[PDB]
Amino acid sequence: MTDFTRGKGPLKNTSDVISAAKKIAEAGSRMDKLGRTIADHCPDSACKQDLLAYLQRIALYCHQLNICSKVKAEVQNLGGELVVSGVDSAMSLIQAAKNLMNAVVQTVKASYVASTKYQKSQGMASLNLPAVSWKMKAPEKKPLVKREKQDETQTKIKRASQKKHVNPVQALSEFKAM
Amino acid sequence: SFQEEKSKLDAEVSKWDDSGNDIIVLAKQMCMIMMEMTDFTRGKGPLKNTSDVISAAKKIAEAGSRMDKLGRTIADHCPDSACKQDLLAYLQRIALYCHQLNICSKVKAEVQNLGGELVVSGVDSAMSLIQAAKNLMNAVVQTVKASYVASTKYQKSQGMASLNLPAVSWKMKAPEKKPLVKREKQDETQTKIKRASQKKHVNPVQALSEFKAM
Amino acid sequence: TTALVCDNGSGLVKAGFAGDDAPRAVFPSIVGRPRHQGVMVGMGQKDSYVGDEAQSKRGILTLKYPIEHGIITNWDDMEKIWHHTFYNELRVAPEEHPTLLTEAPLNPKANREKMTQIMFETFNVPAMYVAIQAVLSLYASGRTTGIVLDSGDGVTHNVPIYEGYALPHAIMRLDLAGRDLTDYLMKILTERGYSFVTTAEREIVRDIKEKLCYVALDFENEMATAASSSSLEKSYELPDGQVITIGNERFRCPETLFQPSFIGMESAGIHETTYNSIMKCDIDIRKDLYANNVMSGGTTMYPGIADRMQKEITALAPSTMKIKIIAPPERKYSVWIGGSILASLSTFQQMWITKQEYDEAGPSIVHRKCF
Amino acid sequence: SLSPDPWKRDAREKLEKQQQMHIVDMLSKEIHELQNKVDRTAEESDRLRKLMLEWQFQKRLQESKQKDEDD
Ligand SMILES: Nc1ncnc2c1ncn2[C@@H]1O[C@H](COP(=O)(O)OP(=O)(O)O)[C@@H](O)[C@H]1O
Ligand SMILES: [Mg+2]
């Protein structure tokens, strides 16, 4: 659905996006169930509190996708596609989708930390903890110096550096099976 | 699973054997008679001439008297509130329309018998009876809805027992969802005089169909 | 079971069940009483008409609005409307349905305290909650960061929100909405010889505005093209068959939103009201607030209002940045849709105002919880 | 699943509408079957009477509803 804006993906029109909205939202409910089981067995600590913070956000984003997609569906039938002929109505659902994914990435890392930290702890038995089925990659080494280029000479106004936002593909690619 | 849901028919079809003991069934019969009289205007119903309209008017007037009696006896036991006043108002309206129907029907019958059929040969004579009938039907629909609301509001009070209250034997379906966005058309270039949209009136067939039985 | 969601505004009343996608009852918020002598026996018993039935009998009634400028002024008529929507519109018993109410920001405290008292004492609901209209518009937009411009029938206000956090010190409320545009149109129409003075005739003028008025991209240039030719003329047919004609008044009426000095108000236009609200926020979040500019309410339904706002903002903001305007097709029901999302939410089921808490705290419980 | 969703309610409404649109066909078939039997029984008159009344009211409602889709 992110690639739908550029029009180079499997989706072709607005109705495809609406169908994709239900699928990602329905998968959100199962993610909430999986995460909450670990939190209940984890003893109260900083990791458990962080884990439950994101599970609050998953419920809000998932519920928004269900109701908002239904509204976009009814508007399509009444006024025709020419009402939604512009792609502007599409980014309403796309914005909530990437908002949900940011919380999903965060709760995966929080769930992993609690599993590894309290792997031996009582109550974690008979559970599919990520600590027994996945491993973390060591983070990449930082550059010792930012190499200068010749493009800064052309620009007469020095601006602040753009903040680097993590890509969910790269955030999940660091997981490796045992 | 198709076989066991035939109880919906049996529950629904069993409401028609009361013989004028329930509000909703009497109102439905009223509605059928009024629909027949209305369709007489186009000459596409059981009524073929004026005398049929006179007989239908007498029948619907008698039904109106029975409905007024039932409304009064259901309104007496309700404690004074905002719902009771509406019920009394529509009961008075029903009484007035029933009396008008009776007297006008008798006068039309006398005129037809005296001056012959050619005096009432034009259909313009029967419009008065049709107008009175539809006014009575609107009043009856309003009083049925008001009676249901009053009965469901005060069904736990004393004296409400031994009454076939419509809130006990009938249930009201929830209203349908409004359209989110107004339908767009090409009327802007088809006509060049914008006009206020005519307000849709409640068809008495629909407002009564939304009652469901258990 | 199902929780009612009632959004009562100055002009219209919206109600329905939480979790749905559209309201189940939309009727005008007027109460009319007869003003003529009754001569036919039995036809004068009814003394008050509420909602749609009052609108069909304008000819023999005096219409009044219980709510003006987002403030309830007639508490006797307001209870009449709330009873109409619970029994004659939704056909539900309030005793087993918690309800959600809405109210504009920067509103007197006594408004919501007395609203809560009626719900618990008169209709006997199990729980309730009062929310902010501008906040609920963000729920329906699928966003958590943006500035909401809500303009209804009585009040226009701006609320900036960043990452789910509100900035109360940057909220601007302006008492100028559709009802003030209707009054200006009646005065303006007298130049052509048309007079509408009756309250029933104000409903006619309101319908004229909704079908013929629009916002001009450039007011000064449009006025030049109005006088030279007659290509902007359109005709409207009155209920009695009379035909009226509108010239430059089509775009003069909605222009007072950007030039409030037409009505005599000293305040600034809605274009630079939003800019002032943005500039009162922190410098770091102004980038995400210039984009994600959400419009809501029926007053923002004029053709070309979104394009006009973008042009005016771009002339004020720095040229390096980008300004976006979000105008959903269903923005007339955005407030209600957000209310349905919030009421049916799983995580929200713990912050209702139960009747037990009202017993030990009274109406003042709403300030500490509802906010 | 986490929260009530409008799609399930929409499916319920569609199923209810289809059930209501098939029960009338069942009623019409029952009327046709009891009408065409030459033999008559005492415990059949009341049933058949209520059946024509219900069918006639349903047909009137359908005819009134159909016109609302036009102008
Ligand atoms: N299509 C339209 N064009 C212009 N003005 C409109 C339009 N629709 C509604 N309005 C005006 O905006 C108001 C919309 O009211 P609404 O936003 O539904 O609730 P509230 O009463 O809370 O404002 C109405 O009073 C009406 O005068
Ligand atoms: Mg509003």
Curated annotation (Swiss-Prot), chain B:
Biased composition annotated in UniProt, kind: Basic and acidic residues: 175-191
Positions of modified residues (Phosphoserine): 162
Family recorded in the similarity comment: Belongs to the vinculin/alpha-catenin family.
Protein name from the UniProt record: Catenin alpha-1
PTM annotation, UniProt: Sumoylated.
Glycyl lysine isopeptide (Lys-Gly) (interchain with G-Cter in SUMO2), cross-linked positions: 108
Natural source organism: Mus musculus
Gene assigned in the entry: Ctnna1
Chain residue ranges for the region called Disordered: 175-205
Function: Associates with the cytoplasmic domain of a variety of cadherins. The association of catenins to cadherins produces a complex which is linked to the actin filament network, and which seems to be of primary importance for cadherins cell-adhesion properties. Can associate with both E- and N-cadherins. Originally believed to be a stable component of E-cadherin/catenin adhesion complexes and to mediate the linkage of cadherins to the actin cytoskeleton at adherens junctions.
Tissues and organs where the protein is expressed, per its UniProt entry: Expressed in cerebellum, heart, liver, small intestine, kidney and placenta (at protein level).
Start-end of Basic residues biased regions: 192-202
Subcellular location: Cytoplasm, Cytoskeleton; Cell junction, Adherens junction; Cell membrane; Cell junction
Tree of life domain: Eukaryota
Quaternary state and interactors: Monomer and homodimer; the monomer preferentially binds to CTNNB1 and the homodimer to actin. Component of an cadherin:catenin adhesion complex composed of at least of CDH26, beta-catenin/CTNNB1, alpha-catenin/CTNNA1 and p120 catenin/CTNND1. Possible component of an E-cadherin/ catenin adhesion complex together with E-cadherin/CDH1 and beta-catenin/CTNNB1 or gamma-catenin/JUP; the complex is located to adherens junctions. The stable association of CTNNA1 is controversial as CTNNA1 was shown not to bind to F-actin when assembled in the complex.
Curated annotation (Swiss-Prot), chain C:
Residues with Methionine (R)-sulfoxide modification: 40, 43
Pfam families, A to Z: Actin (PF00022)
Modification type Tele-methylhistidine: residues: 69
EC number: 3.6.4.-
Subunit structure comment from the entry: Polymerization of globular actin (G-actin) leads to a structural filament (F-actin) in the form of a two-stranded helix. Each actin can bind to 4 others.
Function text: Actins are highly conserved proteins that are involved in various types of cell motility and are ubiquitously expressed in all eukaryotic cells.
Protein's name in the database: Actin, alpha skeletal muscle
Species name: Gallus gallus (Chicken)
GN (gene name): ACTA1
Swiss-Prot record, chain D:
Biased composition (Basic and acidic residues): 6-19
Coiled coil: 16-54
Domain of life assignment: Eukaryota
Tissue: Isoform 1 is expressed only in a restricted set of epithelial structures during early embryogenesis.
Disruption phenotype annotation: Mice show developmental defects at stages during and after gastrulation, including disorganization of the ectoderm, impaired migration of the mesoderm and loss of somites and other structures derived from both the ectoderm and mesoderm. Cell-cell adherens juntions and tight junctions are improperly organized in the ectoderm-derived cells. No redundancy exists in the function of afadin during gastrulation.
Compartment list: Cell junction, Adherens junction
Phosphoserine: residues bearing it: 3
Subunit structure: Homodimer. Interacts with F-actin, nectin and NECTIN3. Essential for the association of nectin and E-cadherin. Isoform 2/s-afadin does not interact with F-actin. Interacts with ZO-1 and occludin, but probably in an indirect manner. Interacts with RIT1, RIT2, NRXN1 and BCR. Interacts with ADAM10; the interaction locks ADAM10 at adherens junctions following ADAM10 recruitment to adherens junctions by TSPAN33.
Role summary: Belongs to an adhesion system, probably together with the E-cadherin-catenin system, which plays a role in the organization of homotypic, interneuronal and heterotypic cell-cell adherens junctions (AJs). Nectin- and actin-filament-binding protein that connects nectin to the actin cytoskeleton. May play a key role in the organization of epithelial structures of the embryonic ectoderm. Essential for the organization of adherens junctions.
Protein name as annotated: Afadin
Originating organism: Mus musculus (Mouse)
